[PDB]
């Protein structure tokens, strides 16, 4: 059944702390194409002005329409706890849709980062897999990246899981990075890096891993 839903994201810890240009995104899914345009309206709880946002539309495989708005937010404003609301307006829409977002609260705890290389498995031995467990952080907002030779790889190179609750109070996450013989041979140095608000200093924790130690 077709049901329009809306999702409002917090800024990536990377964008927020590293690039210091945080954005939030309002995602609207399962729209019926050419049913007129959907309005996405941004607002602040304090009623102060919002920046210009970028809107993206893309017809989907399943013939739903997906619409996003990305709003740049002040680093100070966010970290100081501004609340931002996405309001979604549509013609064939009964109630309007409202998502809001603000800086996550609650206890903080910095991430533990562990990195691992798969042993050589038969078949492709010109490939290995690096994997990373980051766990026991809170809140759940985390950025993961991989570096080779101290330079960050394209995000598309790796897969990262959604934060799941640990048996305790924190969260954990896995990242997978397939690599090539060409890569680890020219330098067997890789880093799994996490960006997290609770990591001190500079909100970063990383761990090195080599294929052949």
């Amino acid at each position: 059944p077709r049901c329009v839903s809306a999702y409002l994201s917090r800024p990536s810890p990377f964008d927020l702390f590293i690039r210091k240009s945080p954005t939030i995104t309002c995602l609207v899914v399962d729209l019926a194409p050419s049913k007129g345009t959907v309005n996405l309206t941004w607002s602040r709880a304090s009623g102060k002005p919002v920046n210009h946002s970028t809107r993206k539309e893309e017809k989907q495989r399943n013939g739903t329409l997906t619409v996003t708005s990305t709003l740049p937010v002040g680093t100070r404003d966010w970290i100081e706890g501004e609340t931002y609301q996405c309001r979604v307006t549509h013609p064939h829409l009964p109630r309007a849709l409202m998502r809001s977002t603000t800086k996550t609260s609650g206890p903080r705890a910095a991430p533990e980062v562990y990195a691992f290389a798969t042993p050589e498995w038969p078949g492709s031995r010109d490939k290995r897999t690096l994997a990373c467990l980051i766990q026991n952080f809170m809140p759940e907002d985390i950025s993961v990246q991989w570096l080779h030779n101290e330079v960050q790889l394209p995000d598309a190179r790796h897969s990262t899981t959604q934060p799941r609750k640990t048996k305790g109070s924190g969260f954990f996450v896995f990242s997978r990075l397939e690599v090539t013989r060409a890569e680890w041979e020219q330098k067997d140095e890789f880093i799994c890096r996490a960006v997290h608000e609770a990591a001190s200093p500079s909100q970063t924790v990383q761990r090195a891993v080599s294929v052949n130690p």
Partner: protein
């Protein structure tokens, strides 16, 4: 001075156990958050109707001074946190309190097209 800082955090968090256990030490029910908000602001918006009364209980101002002129009745109206709005006028929240822009409670009701909001913002 110190106790209050911790308080508001939970005021938004919704740590009721805490919140009830903070005025128990004599908390400043009229604390402000870097942006003149009492907990009452922060309660109002999020559905922490659990704690929105806990404040008024221990005396929180039914119309505090947000440093963008915004009294919690605004910060309620903001959110389709609707049942929350109801109480505000049970004991009177200023119905016509102006922000620094030139905006009140009845204002937001169509800013969001909220028909129920204009419906009950045309009563007391």
């Amino acid at each position: 001075s110190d106790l209050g800082k911790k308080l508001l955090e939970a005021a938004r968090a919704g740590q009721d156990d805490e919140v009830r256990i903070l005025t128990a030490n004599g908390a400043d029910v009229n604390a402000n958050d870097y942006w003149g908000h009492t907990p009452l602001h922060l309660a109002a918006m999020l559905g922490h109707l659990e704690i929105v009364e806990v404040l008024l209980k221990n005396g929180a101002d039914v119309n505090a001074t947000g440093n963008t002129g915004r009294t919690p009745l605004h910060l309620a109206a903001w959110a389709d946190h609707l049942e929350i709005v109801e109480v505000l006028l049970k004991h009177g929240a200023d119905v016509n309190a102006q922000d620094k822009f030139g905006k009140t409670a009845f204002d937001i009701s169509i800013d969001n097209g909220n028909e129920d909001l204009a419906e009950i913002l045309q009563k007391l």
